[PDB]
């Protein structure tokens, strides 16, 4: 099937994970990186900024060739949000719930 299409389908499932009260997709804060001009402090903290759009592109330019590399990239994406955002805040909650889902997804595939 190829790494990119498999990941593309992973991302689609991820986008259907919805918060239970307001139904917002837990992927929402993870879709793209914040703009560096408007959020310069974020990029002095976060060593490896990571978002969903970069993950998909890295699955078709040779950067990620295995699902384990993809899961590792998702891990630092989640770690950055947990590091940056207060425990119990909605961004932190979305990271935990979305990570739980991707973790279960990687077991059912390899």
From Swiss-Prot:
Bromo domain: residues covered: 9-109
Location in or out of the cell: Nucleus
Transmembrane domains' residue ranges: none
Entry's family note: Belongs to the SNF2/RAD54 helicase family.
Role, per record: Catalytic component of the chromatin structure-remodeling complex (RSC), which is involved in transcription regulation and nucleosome positioning. RSC is responsible for the transfer of a histone octamer from a nucleosome core particle to naked DNA. The reaction requires ATP and involves an activated RSC-nucleosome intermediate. Remodeling reaction also involves DNA translocation, DNA twist and conformational change.
Leftover remarks: Present with 1990 molecules/cell in log phase SD medium.
Subunit structure: Interacts directly with SFH1, CSE4, histones H3, H4 and H2B, and via its N-terminus, with RSC8. Interacts with LDB7, NPL6 and RTT102. Component of the two forms of the RSC complex composed of at least either RSC1 or RSC2, and ARP7, ARP9, LDB7, NPL6, RSC3, RSC30, RSC4, RSC58, RSC6, RSC8, RSC9, SFH1, STH1, HTL1 and probably RTT102. The complexes interact with histone and histone variant components of centromeric chromatin.
Name by which UniProt lists this protein: Nuclear protein STH1/NPS1
Organism listed in the record: Saccharomyces cerevisiae (strain ATCC 204508 / S288c) (Baker's yeast)
Organism lineage string: Eukaryota, Fungi, Dikarya, Ascomycota, Saccharomycotina
Name of the gene this protein is made from: STH1
Included range, full protein: 1249 to 1358 of 1359
